[PDB]
Structure formats: structure tokens, C-alpha cells
Amino acid sequence: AHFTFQPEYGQTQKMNLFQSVTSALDNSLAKDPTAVIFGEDVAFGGVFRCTVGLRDKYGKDRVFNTPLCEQGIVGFGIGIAVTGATAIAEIQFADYIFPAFDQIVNEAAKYRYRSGDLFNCGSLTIRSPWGCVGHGALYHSQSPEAFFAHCPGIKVVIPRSPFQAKGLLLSCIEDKNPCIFFEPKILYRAAAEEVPIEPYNIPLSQAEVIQEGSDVTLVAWGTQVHVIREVASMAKEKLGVSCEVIDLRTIIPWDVDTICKSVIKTGRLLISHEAPLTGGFASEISSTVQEECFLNLEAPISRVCGYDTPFPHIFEPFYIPDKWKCYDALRKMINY
Amino acid sequence: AHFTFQPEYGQTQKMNLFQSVTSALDNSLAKDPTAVIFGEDVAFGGVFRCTVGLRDKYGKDRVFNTPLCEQGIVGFGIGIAVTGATAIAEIQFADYIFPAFDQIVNEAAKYRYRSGDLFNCGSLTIRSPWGCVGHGALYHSQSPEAFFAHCPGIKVVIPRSPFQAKGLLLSCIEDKNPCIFFEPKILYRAAAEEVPIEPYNIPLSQAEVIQEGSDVTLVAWGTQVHVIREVASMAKEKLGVSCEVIDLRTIIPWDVDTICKSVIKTGRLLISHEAPLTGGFASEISSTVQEECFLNLEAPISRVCGYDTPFPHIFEPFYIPDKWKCYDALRKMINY
Amino acid sequence: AEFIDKLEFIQPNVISGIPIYRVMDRQGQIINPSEDPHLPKEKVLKLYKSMTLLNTMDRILYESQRQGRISFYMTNYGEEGTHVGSAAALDNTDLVFGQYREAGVLMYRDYPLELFMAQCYGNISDLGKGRQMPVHYGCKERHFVTISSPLATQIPQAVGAAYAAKRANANRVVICYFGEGAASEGDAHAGFNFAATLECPIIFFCRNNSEQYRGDGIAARGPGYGIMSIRVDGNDVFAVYNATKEARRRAVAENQPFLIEAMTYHPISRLRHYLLSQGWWDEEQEKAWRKQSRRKVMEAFEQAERKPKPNPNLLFSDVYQEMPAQLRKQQESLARHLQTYGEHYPLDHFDK
Amino acid sequence: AEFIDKLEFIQPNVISGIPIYRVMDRQGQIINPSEDPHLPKEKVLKLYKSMTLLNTMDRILYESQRQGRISFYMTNYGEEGTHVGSAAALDNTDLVFGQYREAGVLMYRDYPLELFMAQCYGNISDLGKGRQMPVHYGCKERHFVTISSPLATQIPQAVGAAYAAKRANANRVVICYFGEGAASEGDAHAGFNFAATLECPIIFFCRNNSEQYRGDGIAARGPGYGIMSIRVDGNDVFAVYNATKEARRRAVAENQPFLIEAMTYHPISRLRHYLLSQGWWDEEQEKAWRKQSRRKVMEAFEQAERKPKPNPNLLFSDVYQEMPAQLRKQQESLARHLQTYGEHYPLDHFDK
Ligand SMILES: [Cl-]
Ligand SMILES: [Cl-]
Ligand SMILES: [Cl-]
Ligand SMILES: [Cl-]
Ligand SMILES: [K+]
Ligand SMILES: [K+]
Ligand SMILES: [K+]
Ligand SMILES: [K+]
Ligand code: NA
Ligand code: NA
Ligand code: NA
Ligand code: NA
């Protein structure tokens, strides 16, 4: 495997990432009688087991399958949300969110603005599996966040662990803006840790510094956080370099202030993501940090990303911005 | 108006931008018997008169209307192209390209790669009106290029004039990769100039330095080129600053080398576009130039873009990155 | 079903040309008394006055557009009957989704002339804050969801709203208006199918005024989705009313969708003939009403033109509910810019 | 059509339950001699052997998947008849578009076992260069367009190809296979409507094996689009063959689309009973063929496993026809990286 998963709110119990999603969903339906969950295949628990037992607990009118039509799922979701009911839609793989692109970008994101706040779909959240999975190839691997980041009016949120997932998903569900929640599917069974049983929230648009450091700032999100955490340990051991490791968490609106504050301290920045380099969200972080931190930057900002290709099947080990690719770029940046 | 339009291949005649498109299309159908043109409303000349007279000249089987369905238009186009026939699809406004996003990004862009080059849709070109128009508001104004720039496998091309349009459109039609050609609709009648009657090509992935300069490099595309051309003249007259003005032309794959060569010479860069700042294509240019030109950059790179909002109706004069907004940012950058 | 032992393709001939339901002929006479809705005088006059007030407004705003005083306009000519007729069959709180030809629904619901005008002018009275193109109307108070330019996107949204209404146990219907063109969009297929499989109380109201479809119009698609369907004469307000009324009653009771396809191309003329036959109107009333309507519309028009546009700060609000700190930074950047460069901007035409 | 003077909603009852065309009963007997295709012995045996060779391959690759030797697999169980039966009715050069259950079409077209296996293993013999997930087959030589994961995207593409074939004056059809689920996607509505309004020589082949639709399956949608439609028994290779054969002849002659809905859930059993009744097979032949098939598949399987994967450089080609200089820079970056860090990568399992 290319990563290793590692690491106050009442009683907790061991949950993997898919279980933490179920727990968020369950807490949500318990609290909010309007809330419904729907998608292609959610009734009997879903492909990744994220909705197991919810239909039996809450009823077939609240946890139900739609026809196989992503554009419809999102339009339908918008519609529910227009009435003020909580609509939690699932798109089975992030790769299949594109048929819904018009409903998300032209409709959901602009609903409140274009009406003068006479109507909104703030109570919509779209959750979807995301990211590489070892053998997903072109259409079961994709990381579409950069496409959505260029759309004012939506939020895009990506967690790194079961604890982070449940808190961030609850915040999306309760946030008064349409939210896309991308669940890193490679962690569904892999990452396991103590998760509060009862509801809690983690704030949106707030990065998390998971490790303080002084020579360089490392930024990623989802699974890639675990990669840069390892890269930090590699850098300490092999180079004597102290790395500050940051999980962005919310892609838009993003926490410009946390990232810039870190870079003022360290003077160097490397951003990593699985998505292709060109047009990827690392460009927006790099360009912003450069504007705000120009007098502190001792070296060019590094982007260690996927190549500008579709996501391959057999070649995945060579495609992904793994710990060695990140480490080598970090080394070169430190030597600058 | 917020811009002013200004400025070897055989006989020419005065053409505005819509006429130059018709001329490209006509030359294309004349040369290539497989070629067909189709869309919602192209048969009788289209909303912007771009296909006038083509159906009468080439036949109803070659210039025809489809049902009103953008996802279908692009899928259908792909299909034609799979057989090796030239398919020139029109999407009536760029704002309405989003229903086709899945067919463009998941299908067209990946067709050749995913098949090992057993099948392709290289002979597809999608042309669409683009950019602000004074009163288009949210859905007749949009500049979607940054959404497409994060998709390996497609080309995205935007011209600044009638001469540039005809040459770039012919190159798209004949290029062996699916191409999106965005026609700046505010220029359809406004910009007029001599255009060769017979076919010619302008290369893709090549920027054009339209004015040499030594203190700062200014990059834009479409209509915004005319804005930065004026800003250059403002800077010369008011500040004694020499501006190098570059029309990017091809958004992806973009001419990294021309832009970097200019910035090594000038040491400063300002990029401007109508699209919203966040996730906009200026981020990718800024982040790249910074990586390649770090030792030469005397100041932080400026991005003067649309705000991170939907495109408003009544507020358009306040929204757009006009000559004063560009000029002021350029002034501050020069004083850095 | 059963087996068949010979090969036979089903032709598109299956049932028929679907016939067009009519109540009133072109001379305003009831064709079949069993189908007369016997609507009261005051409501029939309200139907007539709504249609003609819309037509007066259309004349004036169309000319305003031709002069460049507003940037864009879409008239209602020939659709006045479908919209008033159907609107009259709904409950006040039934939620409406539409596109460009639905202003008569608002007009029937007593939407003020001042607010139609405010939206078209993008002025300070516009609750849409001047942000959309003209005729992109919306009213929360009158349960008329804000119109958006992209065709057919409202269709699956309307279905979601209807599913939510079913759950809320509402005695509420949703109606969703669209044209035959919009019915070609994928979102139309989504809406129709979702409404049927999810059992939603929704009326799909398709305006049909060769390149778009090859079957027998849009009504012939309904059965294939398991949707109860009818075709009506869109020039006949009573045919429209009757079909909408029965669709609404059944949709709400049975949680099932209905499709009405209204054939259009005069509704106003036909209704006027009806009024005369009852002794409910005459030429003097027609003359006084044309004068009063014109005065009402012209007063709204002149007022709307003279109002300032909204504060340019409204460019930035409602993007999200709250305003992100980075968006506020952009708003602050604009304000700093106008302090220095304001003489180059139309500040005097905008509030504050 | 005409007018109607009473209000009547058209029910989904219109024509019927569409009946299921059958030729051969579950004991392999022809039900109606007028419908016997009288296919020659050699082609019927080819139908049978193709179906059973696919089934043998399925058994072995399914187990390979369960062991983690390939990452993913989709079987063909129960669809063997629909695919071989329809494929036999096509001309060799008719272009096929599909999804996941169409491997029998390839098998009928003599696609090598080595190449099915190469794609599933992503090995050096894969003409797809190892880039897609298993069972995403394609063959230019056999006019089988490369399968992609997104559902229903092939439907409007198939229509475009058919429009192009019409122009080229081809005597060629296109067939487009999809499931009842995929028919819910907007792209399905696009395809069907475009094929009708643009008059395309295409066969839509819908596999139907409550939450998906409410009308009478997919065949009941055809008439509403103006598409000639039929429902067939998908366990009956001769019913499928006959329907495909006639659809192809008419589609190509008339430039019009046809929809076949094949009802599925054994086809192999039924065909085997037919062979016995003619004296065309027996238990000794069955035993020898099962042994030979298994040996052929196992030889391909073992060979496919032992082949190296392609050169990792193939990660970068065919993104565009040419390779952009900036993409070559990324390829060069990879090569520099493997020079230094290669011990951490499976270089020995990949070519060069
Ligand atoms: Cl007037
Ligand atoms: Cl006044
Ligand atoms: Cl086995
Ligand atoms: Cl071997
Ligand atoms: K939300
Ligand atoms: K091309
Ligand atoms: K709309
Ligand atoms: K597909
Ligand atoms: Na419409
Ligand atoms: Na229409
Ligand atoms: Na399918
Ligand atoms: Na199926």
C-alpha cells in the first residue's frame, strides 16, 4: 500500500471510515425529521456499506433508491432542499459526478445568489467516494475537486480519517450551503480509530496543522495527508529537516490564513495531490501563497501531483505522487 | 464599451468575427466532404449568424439542427468522429456546455488514451460563444475555460480577432484531438478587419507577443487582450512603463515557453481574465511561472480577474477586470 | 405479459394521434355542457383581465427592449390562456417551476406590476437584487420559484420538491412548466422517470407551440413512463382549467404524476366571446379596461425607470449564505478601487 | 389529430403488456415453423460453442478475480444467448457499442482468448496498453468500440456513428447494447430522440434482467420516440436472431432506428436441446468440447499471467495523438525518478 494510516466528545467506539459515515448519517436522520438519503443504490447499504441499516431504522421513504441517473439525483436533491428539507444525495463514484455538473454549477451553486435569497438549496449535501484505490483506473479513481473549486457558491470538503469524516460530514449536512463531501474510498476499510457515537462538528474552511515544523510547510488533503506525514518523517530522519504538516480539509472556501501563516514561519511550501498537476487545486494554493508571502519564500513552491493523463489501471504505482516523489521534490526544494 | 478593438495569405476582405467563423466553416466544408455542422439552431444561420448560407451551399445533411440537448450534441459529435468524419458541433452559449461535461471530460478527452489508440474522436471540434457581453448575466456571460483546463486530452482555444479566429478555428477543425473553440461573442459584430478568403492556419499551443516591452509582462486571452493592450498604453503614458503584451490563445496545452521567456526578460507578470479568480486559469500560469522564473521575479505575480461570484446582470460594470482595475494592479506591482 | 409466436414490431401508431381536449369553440360557445366548469363571473373576469393586463405589459416592455431601455424581453403572446387557465386551477400555495412563458401565472397570483418592472430594470426594488437577466422572475410569497436560463433544469427540481411535499403531508401539488424543446433535454427524462418511480404529486405542463421529436408530441411519451397524460387546446382557458383541476386533484390524492400537453401557436379573443355570451362584458367595458390597464402599466413603467439600481455591494452577497472572508476582501478591494477611480463608473445611477 | 370533447387521461395501458417474442420453447422445440430461421448446422454449432466457450472463460476469470490475480471481472451468465444470437444477425463490419455484458459479441467475432486475457491482466499483449479496468474490451479489427465505465455514454455516440454511416452510404448498421438501468440516464433519452429525428440506421439492444421505471419496461418507450420496437425472449437465441436480423434489414434500408428489449434473468440449455433434436450433438461431443474448451482457456490464462506488463512509458502516450512537450517533461521526470528510486517500484514486472 502507498500510505500508512496512523493516529473530549463523550463515548467513542472503533470505526473505520465507512462506519463513521454511517454514524454521521444515522445521527443526522435521528436529529432532523426532514432528512432523507437517496441515490442509485443506497437502500440496501450501498456499494461501500455506507448506508447499512439506515432504511430499516428510518423507513423506506427516507432511505431510498432513485433511477440510475446522476443528473436526476442532483436535480432531485436540489428540489428537496428548495422546500427546506435536508437532502443527502449519493453519487456512487466521484468519477460519475460529471453528468450532474450542470445541476451543481449552474443550479445548486447559484440558486441563492440568483434569487436574491428568495430561494436556496442550502440543505443539500452530495456525498461521493473519491480518490485512488490501487486498481480503479480511469473511472473509479478520480479526484474531481479542482473542477468544483472554480465554482462560487458550493463548498467542497475532504476528510482524512474516520474521526475527521464524521465531524466534517455532519458540518456539511448542517451547513446552509450546498456541499460536496468526497470520501476517500481507499480508507473506507483501511483507516480505523475511535469515533464519538454522538454528534459532533468539525468546522469547514479550516485547515488542521497536524504536526508543527520549522523548515518547510507540506499541504495535502484526503489520503495524501498520510503520505506527506510519512514524508515528514523521512525528511527528519534522512535530512534533519523539520516539516510542518497541514491537512487542508476544505477545498473551497479554503483556509488561506493557516497556510500563509505557516509559510511565513517556514519560508518554503510543497503541495501534493493525486489529481493531475495542470489546473489542479495546488495551482490556486501556490499562486495565492506567492501573492501573500513573496518576501518570505526562500524557494519556488513545489507541486507534487498526478501526471497530466487519465488515471491508468496497470500503471497506477508509477502515476501517483507517492512518498518518494514527494520526498525527492522536498529534498531539491530544501537544497535550493 | 469596456474595450476597444484595434489592428501574406492571398486576397483578403473585411470580416467581423462572426463572418470569419462562417468563412472558416465554409472553407472546411469545401475541403473535407465528410465534414458536418450541427447543433440546436444552426440550420438557418444561428443566433449569432455564424452558419448563414452554409446549409444552402452544402446541403441539409451536412448543416442541420439536432434536438435541444447539449449532452446529446456532444455524444453525437463524438460518434461521428469515431468513424473518422469531421464533426463540428455548436453549443449555443458556453454557459450551456455543462450538461455535456461528462461527454467531454469522461468520453472525448479520454477516448484515444483508454483504447490504446484503437479508436479516437480527434475529428471533433465544439464551438461555442463565450465571455461577457454587457448584459448577459449569469448564463449568457460565462468563461468556462478553467473547468476544461484540468482535463488532459482536450484542447481549449480562444481567439482575439476575426483574423485570429479563422486561423485558429481551421487549426482546431483539422487538429487530430477533440478541441473546444470559444468565440468571444462581444466581438462578433464589434471586431472587424481584413481576413484571407482562402484557408490558412494559426498554430495551437502558441502564444503571440503582440507588443514587445521590457518592464513587465501582461498576459490575457479573448477580449481581455484588447483591455491589456490599452493598459499597456496607459502605463507608457502615465508611468513611463514598457509593457510586453501577450495573447495566450491556447489555454491547454499552453505555451509555457513564450510566457516564461518574457518573464525572464521583464521580471514581472500580471495575468488577467474575466473568469473568477479562484480556480481560474491565471492560477496555473502564475504557479508555473513562479516555478520556472523564481530567480527573475522582482515582485509577486498579479492576477486581475472576475470576482468569486456568479456573473451579475446590473452590476457587470463593477464586476469585470476592466482597464482601471488592471492599471491599478500594474501600478502597485511596478512600485513593489 | 404473455408470449407471442410471430415477429411483429410495434409501430408508433399505438393508441393514435392523441386527440386535443376542447371545451369552447372559437366563437366562445361551450361544446358539451357536461364539461362546462361553470366558473363564477368574478373568477372568469379575473382570467380575462389577467390575460389582457399581461398583454398590455408585454407591448410596453417589448418596445422598451427594442429601444435598449431594458436589455432583454420575452413576451407571452398566445400563451396567456394556458397560464391563467392552469393557475386558476391551482391552490395559492402550490409551488410553481417554469421557464420564460409563465409570467401569466404570476399575474394571476397578483404579482405587482412594480415588481415585474423592477426585475426587468434591475432596480433597487428588485428582490432578486438586479442579478439576473430580465424576465427571470421569482416570488417566495407567491410560491413561484426563480427562473433560470438553462433549459429544463427545473424539471427534476420540481420532482424533488413534490417528493418533499408528499413527505410533509401537505395537500400541496407542484406544477412544472416547460416547452417541447426543453423536453428534449436529459433533465426532462430524469424528471419524468423520477416522478413516476418515486410517486410524486406533480403536474408536468408542457407547452407545445419535426426537428425536436418524431413521435406524437410530448403527451405520447407519458404512458411509456407510466404517467397519466392528456393533450389540451391551449387556446381554450376552460379546457386548460379543467385538465389542471382534475390533474391536481388526482396527483395530490394518489401521489402520482400527470402530464398535460397544451397545444398552442387567440385565447384572449375566445374568452372575450364567452364573456359577451353570458352578458358579462361589452364594448364600453372593453374600452375602459384597455385605458385603465394601459395607465396602470405606464405608471409602473415610469416609476421603474426612474429608480436607482441597487448598491454595487450587492454584487457580493448571497453567493453563500454568509460571506466568506476572502469574498469580503474582494468587496473591500472594489470599495478601495471606487474611491480612487470612481469617476470612471456609473456610481450616480446606483444606490448609496 | 382530431378534437375530443370529454376529459380523459390516457392511462399507461395503451396497447398492452407488450408480449415477448419466442421461437423455441424451453425443451428446444420450434413453436411455429413459419418463424424458424433454418440456420445451417455449422452456424448453429458456432452459436453453441461461442456461448459455452464464454461460459468456460467466465468460470476461470471469475475465480482469478476472487483470488486477486486480476482486479475486477464481470460475467456473462444468462446473457450468452442475447449476445451470440444478435451478433450472428449482424454483418461482420457493423459497428458495435456496449457496456459490460457484451463479451459474447466479441467471442462470436472470433476475438482471441489471448486478448480477452491480455486486457484483464493489463499485460504487454493488450492493445489497450493496460490502461483500463478489466473487461473494458475493444477491437478495431472487429468493429467493437472500446467499453468505458460511465453508463449510457455510448448511446448518443452510437447514434452519431450511425448518422455518419448513413452519409457514407454504407450498407452498415450500428448496434448499441445497454441495460435497463442505463436507459434511465439522460444520455439514453438523447440517443433515442436523436436517432429518430435524425433518421439513423441503428439497433438499440436493451437487456432487461420497479425502482428503475414504472411503464411497461423499455420497449414501451420506443413508440413515444417514434421508434419501431419489439420485446424478445433473451433465453431464446433464435428469437433474438430473428428480431436482430429483421431490425438490421429495415434499419439499413429505411434509415430508421429499431429498439429490441431482450428479457433475461437458460439460453445454453435451450440451444443444446435444439441441437440434440436435429441430431447435431450428443453427450460424447459435449464431453470432448468441455475438455477442449477448458484446455484452450487454461492455456490462454497461464500465458497471460506470465507475460510482463507494458513499458511504464505507455502511461504518457495517446493522451493526445502527439505528446505535448510538457507531458514529455513529466515522462522524463518519471525516468529520472526511477533511475534514483527504482528499487521501490515493480520494474521487473514491466517491460523494458
Ligand atoms: Cl409602446
Ligand atoms: Cl415615479
Ligand atoms: Cl477455476
Ligand atoms: Cl506461456
Ligand atoms: K448543506
Ligand atoms: K479536432
Ligand atoms: K431553467
Ligand atoms: K459506457
Ligand atoms: Na422551456
Ligand atoms: Na417551444
Ligand atoms: Na448497461
Ligand atoms: Na440491468
From Swiss-Prot, chains A, B:
Its main location: mitochondrion. GO terms for molecular function: 3-methyl-2-oxobutanoate dehydrogenase (2-methylpropanoyl-transferring) activity. Thiamine diphosphate binds at residue 96. It catalyses: N(6)-[(R)-lipoyl]-L-lysyl-[protein] + 3-methyl-2-oxobutanoate + H(+) = N(6)-[(R)-S(8)-2-methylpropanoyldihydrolipoyl]-L-lysyl-[protein] + CO2. The keyword Mitochondrion applies. Keywords: Acetylation, Disease variant, Lipid metabolism, Maple syrup urine disease, Mitochondrion, Oxidoreductase, Transit peptide. Its EC number is 1.2.4.4. K(+) binds at residues 122, 124-125, 172, 175, 177. It is found in: Mitochondrion matrix. It holds the Pfam family Transketolase_C. Its cofactor is thiamine diphosphate. It is an enzyme of class 1 (oxidoreductase). One of its GO terms (cellular component) is nucleolus. InterPro entries: THDP-binding (IPR029061), Transketo_C/PFOR_II (IPR009014), Transketolase-like_Pyr-bd (IPR005475), Transketolase_C (IPR033248). The modification N6-acetyllysine is found at residues 176, 185. It comes from the Eukaryota. GO terms for biological process: branched-chain amino acid catabolic process; lipid metabolic process; response to nutrient. Together with BCKDHA forms the heterotetrameric E1 subunit of the mitochondrial branched-chain alpha-ketoacid dehydrogenase (BCKD) complex. The BCKD complex catalyzes the multi-step oxidative decarboxylation of alpha-ketoacids derived from the branched-chain amino-acids valine, leucine and isoleucine producing CO2 and acyl-CoA which is subsequently utilized to produce energy. The E1 subunit catalyzes the first step with the decarboxylation of the alpha-ketoacid forming an enzyme-product intermediate. Heterotetramer of 2 alpha/BCKDHA and 2 beta chains/BCKDHB that forms the branched-chain alpha-keto acid decarboxylase (E1) component of the BCKD complex. The branched-chain alpha-ketoacid dehydrogenase is a large complex composed of three major building blocks E1, E2 and E3. It is organized around E2, a 24-meric cubic core composed of DBT, to which are associated 6 to 12 copies of E1, and approximately 6 copies of the dehydrogenase E3, a DLD dimer. PANTHER family: 2-OXOISOVALERATE DEHYDROGENASE SUBUNIT BETA, MITOCHONDRIAL, 2-OXOISOVALERATE DEHYDROGENASE SUBUNIT BETA-RELATED. It is linked to Maple syrup urine disease 1B: A form of maple syrup urine disease, an autosomal recessive metabolic disorder due to an enzyme defect in the catabolic pathway of the branched-chain amino acids leucine, isoleucine, and valine. Accumulation of these 3 amino acids and their corresponding keto acids leads to encephalopathy and progressive neurodegeneration. Clinical features include mental and physical retardation, feeding problems, and a maple syrup odor to the urine. The keto acids of the branched-chain amino acids are present in the urine. This is 2-oxoisovalerate dehydrogenase subunit beta, mitochondrial.
From Swiss-Prot, chains C, D:
Its EC number is 1.2.4.4. The keyword Oxidoreductase applies. Heterotetramer of 2 alpha/BCKDHA and 2 beta chains/BCKDHB that forms the branched-chain alpha-keto acid decarboxylase (E1) component of the BCKD complex. The branched-chain alpha-ketoacid dehydrogenase is a large complex composed of three major building blocks E1, E2 and E3. It is organized around E2, a 24-meric cubic core composed of DBT, to which are associated 6 to 12 copies of E1, and approximately 6 copies of the dehydrogenase E3, a DLD dimer. Interacts with PPM1K. Changing residue 224 to R: In MSUD1A; no effect on solubility; no effect on mitochondrial alpha-ketoglutarate dehydrogenase complex assembly; decreased 3-methyl-2-oxobutanoate dehydrogenase activity. Gene3D superfamilies: 3.40.50.970. Changing residue 320 to C: In MSUD1A; uncertain significance; decreased solubility; changed mitochondrial alpha-ketoglutarate dehydrogenase complex assembly; loss of 3-methyl-2-oxobutanoate dehydrogenase activity. The keyword Transit peptide applies. The modification N6-succinyllysine is found at residue 287. Pfam families: E1_dh. Together with BCKDHB forms the heterotetrameric E1 subunit of the mitochondrial branched-chain alpha-ketoacid dehydrogenase (BCKD) complex. The BCKD complex catalyzes the multi-step oxidative decarboxylation of alpha-ketoacids derived from the branched-chain amino-acids valine, leucine and isoleucine producing CO2 and acyl-CoA which is subsequently utilized to produce energy. The E1 subunit catalyzes the first step with the decarboxylation of the alpha-ketoacid forming an enzyme-product intermediate. This is 2-oxoisovalerate dehydrogenase subunit alpha, mitochondrial. Belongs to the BCKDHA family. It comes from the Eukaryota. It is an enzyme of class 1 (oxidoreductase). It is found in: Mitochondrion matrix. Thiamine diphosphate binds at residues 100-101, 149, 181-182, 207. GO terms for molecular function: 3-methyl-2-oxobutanoate dehydrogenase (2-methylpropanoyl-transferring) activity; carboxy-lyase activity; metal ion binding. Keywords: Acetylation, Disease variant, Maple syrup urine disease, Metal-binding, Mitochondrion, Oxidoreductase, Phosphoprotein, Potassium, Thiamine pyrophosphate, Transit peptide. Signal peptide: none annotated. InterPro entries: Alpha-ketoacid_DH_E1_comp, DH_E1, THDP-binding. Its cofactor is thiamine diphosphate; Mg(2+). It catalyses: N(6)-[(R)-lipoyl]-L-lysyl-[protein] + 3-methyl-2-oxobutanoate + H(+) = N(6)-[(R)-S(8)-2-methylpropanoyldihydrolipoyl]-L-lysyl-[protein] + CO2. One of its GO terms (biological process) is branched-chain amino acid catabolic process.
